[PDB]
Amino acid sequence: VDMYIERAGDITWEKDAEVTGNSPRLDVALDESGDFSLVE
């Protein structure tokens, strides 16, 4: 089972990007296994 990498682009900001998505404010906890969960 071999894992390999392939270059896909430069790391650059693009002035013409699509703009989308909300900005939710969430209470979360992060456990030892790296899992985020909601808290109330």
Binding site: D2, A8, G9, W13, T20, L26, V28, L30, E32, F36
Partner: protein, 147 residues
């Protein structure tokens, strides 16, 4: 070894994630590779540091990315989905509020093979990687390591 964003592929072939090459170090998320060695052409990249709780791993050297979201500005996800050209998605992050402080978060839902894609600030610095998050719709932390 060139700076840039890269697909992480496995063998037919399947894209399991994405990562960032910067200053000779490859950065991706632990859940993508589990620290396995990576092939790059005829060369090999060996793991150097990793942490399951942060869900991060670096290859060939220590974690180099250190920029952080400014808490006010829009950012861009440089998404590299399976089968698609690298593309920039601009968004205003929300916030994960945790007992250890606030983390930027992006309410963007791309295929799992996009995990490891970098999130950028306006000057083009990587402020974290996409693909560890929570469901409210999926919301990804902006996950950054320590340099």
């Amino acid at each position: 070894t060139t700076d840039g964003v890269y697909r992480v592929m496995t063998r037919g072939s399947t894209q399991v994630g994405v990562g960032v090459m910067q200053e000779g170090v490859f950065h991706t998320m632990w859940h993508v590779t589990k620290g396995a060695a990576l092939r790059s052409g005829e060369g090999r990249l060996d793991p150097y540091w990793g942490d399951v709780k942060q869900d991060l791993v670096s290859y060939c050297g220590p974690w180099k990315l250190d920029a952080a979201w400014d808490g006010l500005s829009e950012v861009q996800l440089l998404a590299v989905p399976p089968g698609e050209r690298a593309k920039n998605i601009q968004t205003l992050p929300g916030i994960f509020k945790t007992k250890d402080g606030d983390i930027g978060a992006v309410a963007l839902d791309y295929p799992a093979g996009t995990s490891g894609s970098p999130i950028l600030d306006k000057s083009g610095r990587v402020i974290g990687l996409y693909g560890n998050g929570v469901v409210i719709s999926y919301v990804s932390a902006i996950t950054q390591g320590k340099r």
